[PDB]
Amino acid sequence: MIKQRTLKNIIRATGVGLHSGEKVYLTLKPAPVDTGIVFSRTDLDPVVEIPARAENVGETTMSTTLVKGDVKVDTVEHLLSAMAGLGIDNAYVELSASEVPIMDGSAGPFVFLIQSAGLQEQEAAKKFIRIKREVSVEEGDKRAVFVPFDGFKVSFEIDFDHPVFQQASVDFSSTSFVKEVSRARTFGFMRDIEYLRSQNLALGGSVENAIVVDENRVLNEDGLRYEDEFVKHKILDAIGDLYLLGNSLIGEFRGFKSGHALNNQLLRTLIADKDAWEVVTFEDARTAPISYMRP
Numbered sequence: 001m002i003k004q005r006t007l008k009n010i011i012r013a014t015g016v017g018l019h020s021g022e023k024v025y026l027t028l029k030p031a032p033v034d035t036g037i038v039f040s041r042t043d044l045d046p047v048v049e050i051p052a053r054a055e056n057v058g059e060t061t062m063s064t065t066l067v068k069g070d071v072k073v074d075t076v077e078h079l080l081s082a083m084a085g086l087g088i089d090n091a092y093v094e095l096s097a098s099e100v101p102i103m104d105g106s107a108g109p110f111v112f113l114i115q116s117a118g119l120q121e122q123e124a125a126k127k128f129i130r131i132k133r134e135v136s137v138e139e140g141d142k143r144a145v146f147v148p149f150d151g152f153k154v155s156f157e158i159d160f161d162h163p164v165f166q167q168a169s170v171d172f173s174s175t176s177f178v179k180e181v182s183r184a185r186t187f188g189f190m191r192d193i194e195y196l197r198s199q200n201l202a203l204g205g206s207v208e209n210a211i212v213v214d215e216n217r218v219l220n221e222d223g224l225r226y227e228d229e230f231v232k233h234k235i236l237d238a239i240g241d242l243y244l245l246g247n248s249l250i251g252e253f254r255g256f257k258s259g260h261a262l263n264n265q266l267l268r269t270l271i272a273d274k275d276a277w278e279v280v281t282f283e284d285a286r287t288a289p290i291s292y293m294r295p
Protein backbone atom coordinates (compact mmCIF):
# COMPACT_ATOMS: atom_id res chain seq x y z
CA MET A 1 0.00 0.00 0.00
CA ILE A 2 1.04 3.64 -0.13
CA LYS A 3 1.71 4.17 3.61
CA GLN A 4 1.50 7.31 5.77
CA ARG A 5 4.81 9.09 6.54
CA THR A 6 6.17 10.90 9.53
CA LEU A 7 9.65 12.06 10.55
CA LYS A 8 12.24 9.47 11.62
CA ASN A 9 14.03 12.00 13.80
CA ILE A 10 13.47 15.46 15.09
CA ILE A 11 14.67 18.51 13.21
CA ARG A 12 15.57 21.82 14.66
CA ALA A 13 16.39 25.07 13.10
CA THR A 14 16.73 28.71 13.95
CA GLY A 15 15.71 31.65 11.76
CA VAL A 16 13.78 34.87 11.40
CA GLY A 17 10.16 35.65 10.43
CA LEU A 18 10.00 37.37 7.01
CA HIS A 19 7.24 39.67 8.19
CA SER A 20 7.79 39.90 11.95
CA GLY A 21 11.61 39.99 11.78
CA GLU A 22 11.61 37.96 15.06
CA LYS A 23 14.07 35.22 15.83
CA VAL A 24 12.31 31.87 16.01
CA TYR A 25 13.26 28.34 16.92
CA LEU A 26 11.63 25.62 14.99
CA THR A 27 11.32 21.94 15.94
CA LEU A 28 9.65 19.30 13.82
CA LYS A 29 8.74 16.05 15.44
CA PRO A 30 7.22 12.70 14.61
CA ALA A 31 3.47 12.34 15.07
CA PRO A 32 1.14 9.31 15.09
CA VAL A 33 -1.02 8.18 12.07
CA ASP A 34 -3.85 10.49 11.08
CA THR A 35 -2.46 13.44 13.07
CA GLY A 36 -1.89 15.62 10.06
CA ILE A 37 0.48 18.59 10.37
CA VAL A 38 -0.09 20.51 13.62
CA PHE A 39 1.64 23.78 14.48
CA SER A 40 2.37 24.48 18.18
CA ARG A 41 3.27 27.85 19.73
CA THR A 42 5.54 26.58 22.53
CA ASP A 43 6.42 30.13 23.74
CA LEU A 44 2.96 30.30 25.29
CA ASP A 45 1.76 28.71 28.51
CA PRO A 46 -0.24 26.69 27.85
CA VAL A 47 1.10 25.78 24.44
CA VAL A 48 -1.33 26.62 21.60
CA GLU A 49 -1.73 24.02 18.85
CA ILE A 50 -3.33 24.86 15.47
CA PRO A 51 -3.80 22.09 12.91
CA ALA A 52 -2.60 23.05 9.44
CA ARG A 53 -6.08 23.00 7.94
CA ALA A 54 -8.02 25.31 5.68
CA GLU A 55 -10.56 25.98 8.47
CA ASN A 56 -7.78 27.60 10.56
CA VAL A 57 -6.52 30.11 7.97
CA GLY A 58 -7.01 33.55 9.38
CA GLU A 59 -5.38 36.05 7.07
CA THR A 60 -4.03 35.71 3.54
CA THR A 61 -2.21 39.00 2.83
CA MET A 62 1.34 38.43 1.55
CA SER A 63 1.45 35.12 3.49
CA THR A 64 -0.80 32.31 4.73
CA THR A 65 -1.56 32.70 8.46
CA LEU A 66 -3.13 30.17 10.80
CA VAL A 67 -5.20 31.68 13.67
CA LYS A 68 -6.84 30.31 16.81
CA GLY A 69 -8.39 33.13 18.77
CA ASP A 70 -5.78 35.79 19.26
CA VAL A 71 -2.96 33.42 18.51
CA LYS A 72 -1.32 33.08 15.05
CA VAL A 73 1.31 31.19 13.14
CA ASP A 74 2.20 33.23 10.10
CA THR A 75 3.87 32.24 6.85
CA VAL A 76 3.22 28.49 6.85
CA GLU A 77 3.21 27.93 3.07
CA HIS A 78 6.96 27.23 2.33
CA LEU A 79 7.24 24.66 5.09
CA LEU A 80 3.91 23.18 4.14
CA SER A 81 5.14 23.10 0.56
CA ALA A 82 8.16 21.03 1.72
CA MET A 83 6.10 18.61 3.79
CA ALA A 84 3.73 18.07 0.88
CA GLY A 85 6.57 17.67 -1.56
CA LEU A 86 8.20 14.94 0.59
CA GLY A 87 4.98 13.06 1.36
CA ILE A 88 4.92 13.96 5.10
CA ASP A 89 1.39 13.26 6.52
CA ASN A 90 1.94 13.61 10.30
CA ALA A 91 4.25 15.97 12.17
CA TYR A 92 4.25 18.47 15.02
CA VAL A 93 5.86 21.76 14.13
CA GLU A 94 6.81 23.66 17.29
CA LEU A 95 7.58 27.37 16.99
CA SER A 96 8.91 29.73 19.73
CA ALA A 97 7.24 32.70 18.01
CA SER A 98 4.37 33.76 15.70
CA GLU A 99 6.04 33.07 12.29
CA VAL A 100 7.79 30.13 10.66
CA PRO A 101 11.45 31.08 9.92
CA ILE A 102 11.98 32.18 6.34
CA MET A 103 15.40 30.48 5.95
CA ASP A 104 16.72 31.46 2.48
CA GLY A 105 13.28 32.27 1.03
CA SER A 106 12.58 28.79 -0.40
CA ALA A 107 11.75 25.29 0.72
CA GLY A 108 15.35 24.07 0.00
CA PRO A 109 16.51 24.31 3.65
CA PHE A 110 13.38 22.53 4.92
CA VAL A 111 13.65 19.65 2.42
CA PHE A 112 17.36 19.26 3.24
CA LEU A 113 16.79 19.26 7.02
CA ILE A 114 13.87 16.82 6.65
CA GLN A 115 15.69 14.43 4.42
CA SER A 116 18.82 14.54 6.63
CA ALA A 117 16.56 13.48 9.57
CA GLY A 118 14.87 10.86 7.38
CA LEU A 119 11.28 9.75 7.04
CA GLN A 120 9.46 6.89 8.63
CA GLU A 121 6.65 4.99 6.90
CA GLN A 122 3.65 4.21 9.18
CA GLU A 123 1.48 1.08 9.13
CA ALA A 124 -1.67 2.82 7.76
CA ALA A 125 -2.75 3.67 4.27
CA LYS A 126 -1.99 7.26 3.09
CA LYS A 127 -5.30 9.11 2.39
CA PHE A 128 -5.51 11.28 -0.71
CA ILE A 129 -8.15 13.82 -1.77
CA ARG A 130 -9.18 12.96 -5.34
CA ILE A 131 -10.67 15.67 -7.54
CA LYS A 132 -13.72 14.27 -9.28
CA ARG A 133 -15.26 17.47 -10.77
CA GLU A 134 -13.86 20.81 -11.86
CA VAL A 135 -14.09 23.43 -9.17
CA SER A 136 -13.09 26.99 -9.95
CA VAL A 137 -13.15 30.28 -8.14
CA GLU A 138 -12.51 33.66 -9.53
CA GLU A 139 -12.38 37.21 -8.38
CA GLY A 140 -11.82 39.93 -10.95
CA ASP A 141 -8.94 38.82 -13.27
CA LYS A 142 -7.61 36.20 -10.81
CA ARG A 143 -8.64 32.53 -11.08
CA ALA A 144 -7.88 29.22 -9.39
CA VAL A 145 -9.15 25.85 -10.45
CA PHE A 146 -9.05 22.21 -9.60
CA VAL A 147 -9.47 19.80 -12.51
CA PRO A 148 -9.73 16.00 -12.25
CA PHE A 149 -6.45 14.33 -13.22
CA ASP A 150 -4.89 10.94 -12.54
CA GLY A 151 -1.74 12.16 -10.81
CA PHE A 152 -0.75 15.58 -9.50
CA LYS A 153 0.15 18.55 -11.56
CA VAL A 154 0.28 22.28 -11.04
CA SER A 155 0.13 25.03 -13.51
CA PHE A 156 0.61 28.71 -12.92
CA GLU A 157 0.47 31.90 -14.87
CA ILE A 158 1.43 35.32 -13.50
CA ASP A 159 0.89 38.58 -15.21
CA PHE A 160 3.51 40.95 -13.85
CA ASP A 161 3.83 44.23 -15.58
CA HIS A 162 7.66 44.49 -15.22
CA PRO A 163 11.01 44.60 -17.18
CA VAL A 164 12.48 41.61 -15.42
CA PHE A 165 9.96 39.64 -17.64
CA GLN A 166 5.52 34.08 -17.05
CA GLN A 167 3.98 30.68 -16.78
CA ALA A 168 4.88 27.19 -15.90
CA SER A 169 3.51 23.77 -15.48
CA VAL A 170 4.88 20.98 -13.41
CA ASP A 171 3.62 17.45 -13.34
CA PHE A 172 5.10 15.37 -10.58
CA SER A 173 5.24 12.31 -13.00
CA SER A 174 8.44 13.86 -14.36
CA THR A 175 9.22 16.89 -12.22
CA SER A 176 11.27 16.56 -8.99
CA PHE A 177 9.74 18.84 -6.31
CA VAL A 178 13.19 18.89 -4.76
CA LYS A 179 15.34 19.73 -7.81
CA GLU A 180 12.94 21.86 -9.85
CA VAL A 181 10.66 23.61 -7.33
CA SER A 182 12.05 23.52 -3.80
CA ARG A 183 14.86 26.05 -4.32
CA ALA A 184 12.71 28.79 -5.77
CA ARG A 185 12.88 31.83 -3.55
CA THR A 186 10.48 34.35 -2.11
CA PHE A 187 10.44 37.60 -4.13
CA GLY A 188 9.42 41.16 -3.94
CA PHE A 189 9.46 44.55 -5.62
CA MET A 190 10.96 47.63 -4.05
CA ARG A 191 7.68 49.67 -4.30
CA ASP A 192 5.75 47.02 -2.32
CA ILE A 193 8.54 46.31 0.15
CA GLU A 194 8.47 49.97 1.38
CA TYR A 195 4.61 49.95 1.55
CA LEU A 196 4.74 46.62 3.45
CA ARG A 197 7.32 48.05 5.89
CA SER A 198 5.09 51.17 6.27
CA GLN A 199 2.29 48.69 7.03
CA ASN A 200 4.75 47.17 9.51
CA LEU A 201 5.24 43.99 7.40
CA ALA A 202 8.26 42.53 5.58
CA LEU A 203 10.44 43.39 8.57
CA GLY A 204 12.74 40.39 8.22
CA GLY A 205 13.25 40.41 4.47
CA SER A 206 16.60 41.04 2.87
CA VAL A 207 18.70 39.77 -0.04
CA GLU A 208 19.50 36.79 2.22
CA ASN A 209 15.96 35.36 2.19
CA ALA A 210 14.38 36.89 -0.94
CA ILE A 211 14.89 37.98 -4.54
CA VAL A 212 14.78 41.76 -4.30
CA VAL A 213 13.68 43.55 -7.56
CA ASP A 214 13.80 47.32 -8.36
CA GLU A 215 12.06 48.83 -11.38
CA ASN A 216 14.41 46.99 -13.77
CA ARG A 217 16.42 44.25 -12.22
CA VAL A 218 17.07 41.65 -9.57
CA LEU A 219 19.45 43.32 -7.05
CA ASN A 220 20.74 40.11 -5.48
CA GLU A 221 24.41 39.89 -6.47
CA ASP A 222 24.24 36.19 -7.38
CA GLY A 223 21.10 36.39 -9.55
CA LEU A 224 18.51 33.65 -10.07
CA ARG A 225 18.43 29.94 -9.26
CA TYR A 226 16.16 29.18 -12.19
CA GLU A 227 15.42 31.28 -15.23
CA ASP A 228 11.71 31.15 -14.28
CA GLU A 229 12.28 31.32 -10.43
CA PHE A 230 9.36 33.66 -9.80
CA VAL A 231 6.68 31.53 -11.24
CA LYS A 232 8.30 28.33 -9.84
CA HIS A 233 7.99 30.02 -6.42
CA LYS A 234 4.29 30.72 -7.04
CA ILE A 235 3.94 26.96 -7.66
CA LEU A 236 5.84 26.30 -4.45
CA ASP A 237 3.45 28.62 -2.53
CA ALA A 238 0.38 27.03 -4.16
CA ILE A 239 1.51 23.47 -3.21
CA GLY A 240 1.86 24.72 0.37
CA ASP A 241 -1.56 26.42 0.43
CA LEU A 242 -3.14 23.33 -1.05
CA TYR A 243 -1.65 21.10 1.60
CA LEU A 244 -4.00 22.82 4.03
CA LEU A 245 -6.54 20.34 2.70
CA GLY A 246 -4.61 18.07 5.11
CA ASN A 247 -4.06 15.28 2.51
CA SER A 248 -2.21 15.05 -0.79
CA LEU A 249 -4.18 15.72 -3.93
CA ILE A 250 -4.89 13.52 -6.89
CA GLY A 251 -5.84 16.18 -9.44
CA GLU A 252 -4.63 19.22 -11.23
CA PHE A 253 -4.40 22.81 -10.03
CA ARG A 254 -4.28 25.78 -12.28
CA GLY A 255 -3.62 29.27 -11.00
CA PHE A 256 -4.04 32.53 -12.94
CA LYS A 257 -2.69 35.43 -10.96
CA SER A 258 -3.93 33.66 -7.84
CA GLY A 259 -2.47 34.25 -4.39
CA HIS A 260 -2.95 33.02 -0.84
CA ALA A 261 -6.46 34.52 -0.65
CA LEU A 262 -7.94 32.90 -3.78
CA ASN A 263 -6.08 29.62 -3.06
CA ASN A 264 -7.81 29.46 0.33
CA GLN A 265 -11.14 30.43 -1.27
CA LEU A 266 -10.66 27.45 -3.61
CA LEU A 267 -10.02 25.00 -0.76
CA ARG A 268 -13.14 26.23 0.98
CA THR A 269 -15.39 25.90 -2.07
CA LEU A 270 -13.88 22.46 -2.68
CA ILE A 271 -14.44 21.28 0.84
CA ALA A 272 -18.01 22.55 0.73
CA ASP A 273 -18.68 20.74 -2.53
CA LYS A 274 -18.55 17.12 -1.52
CA ASP A 275 -19.65 15.97 -5.01
CA ALA A 276 -16.32 17.27 -6.36
CA TRP A 277 -13.94 15.15 -4.22
CA GLU A 278 -13.60 11.92 -2.33
CA VAL A 279 -10.88 10.44 -0.04
CA VAL A 280 -9.02 7.47 -1.39
CA THR A 281 -6.30 5.06 -0.38
CA PHE A 282 -4.10 2.76 -2.45
CA GLU A 283 -3.62 -0.74 -1.10
CA ASP A 284 -1.26 -1.63 -3.95
CA ALA A 285 1.26 1.10 -4.68
CA ARG A 286 1.81 -0.51 -8.11
CA THR A 287 -1.55 0.60 -9.51
CA ALA A 288 -1.64 4.08 -8.00
CA PRO A 289 -1.36 7.21 -10.19
CA ILE A 290 1.38 8.71 -8.09
CA SER A 291 4.58 7.58 -6.47
CA TYR A 292 6.88 8.92 -3.84
CA MET A 293 10.67 8.76 -3.60
CA ARG A 294 12.08 6.22 -1.18
CA PRO A 295 11.66 7.10 2.54
Ligand SMILES: C[C@H](O)c1nccn1Cc1cc(-c2ccc(C#CCCCO)cc2)on1
Pocket residue numbers: 018062063064075077078185186187188189193202204205206207210211212233237
Ligand atom coordinates in the same frame (compact mmCIF):
# COMPACT_ATOMS: atom_id res chain seq x y z
C1 LIG B 1 5.76 34.98 1.95
C2 LIG B 1 4.95 34.71 0.72
O1 LIG B 1 4.71 33.28 0.62
C3 LIG B 1 5.65 35.17 -0.50
N1 LIG B 1 6.32 34.39 -1.36
C4 LIG B 1 6.79 35.09 -2.31
C5 LIG B 1 6.43 36.41 -2.08
N2 LIG B 1 5.71 36.43 -0.96
C6 LIG B 1 5.08 37.61 -0.39
C7 LIG B 1 6.08 38.48 0.26
C8 LIG B 1 7.32 38.85 -0.23
C9 LIG B 1 7.94 39.60 0.73
C10 LIG B 1 9.27 40.29 0.72
C11 LIG B 1 9.54 41.12 1.78
C12 LIG B 1 10.72 41.83 1.88
C13 LIG B 1 11.68 41.68 0.87
C14 LIG B 1 12.79 42.36 0.97
C15 LIG B 1 13.77 43.02 1.08
C16 LIG B 1 14.99 43.86 1.21
C17 LIG B 1 14.64 45.33 1.06
C18 LIG B 1 15.76 46.19 1.64
O2 LIG B 1 16.32 46.98 0.59
C19 LIG B 1 11.41 40.83 -0.20
C20 LIG B 1 10.20 40.13 -0.27
O3 LIG B 1 7.02 39.67 1.74
N3 LIG B 1 5.93 38.96 1.50
Ligand SMILES: [Zn+2]
Pocket residue numbers: 077078186233237
Ligand atom coordinates in the same frame (compact mmCIF):
# COMPACT_ATOMS: atom_id res chain seq x y z
ZN1 LIG C 1 6.11 32.30 -0.98
